[PDB]
């Protein structure tokens, strides 16, 4: 799947878009957030003020189902 960063996350991660082979959302986030811990707490739980869209829809609707290779994951910070 394709990961797109929005807002301050772009400068904080130092990239805007990246592809990852992971089909499990948590693993996608861990690969992105590996040595930085910017969007995940130590418990790998998402930090507050971060939303995730999968193909334009809130991630929680998907119930941790298999991601397809062509899915677009948007990570969006909010106030």
Residue numbers in the entry: 2 to 80
Wording from the paper:
The eukaryotic Urm1 (ubiquitin-related modifier-1) protein, which displays both structural and amino-acid sequence homology to the prokaryotic ThiS and MoaD, has been proposed as a candidate for the evolutionary ‘missing link' between the eukaryotic Ub/Ubl family and the ancestral prokaryotic sulphur-transfer proteins1617181920212223. Covalent attachment of the modifier, referred to as SAMPylation, occurs between the conserved C-terminal di-glycine motif of SAMP, and specific lysine residues on a variety of target proteins, in a manner reminiscent of urmylation and ubiquitylation. Here we solve the crystal structure of an Urm1/SAMP homologue from the related species S. solfataricus, which reveals similarities to both eukaryotic Urm1 proteins, and other archaeal SAMPs. Taken together, our data suggest that Urm1/SAMP modification acts as a signal for substrate recognition by the archaeal proteasome.
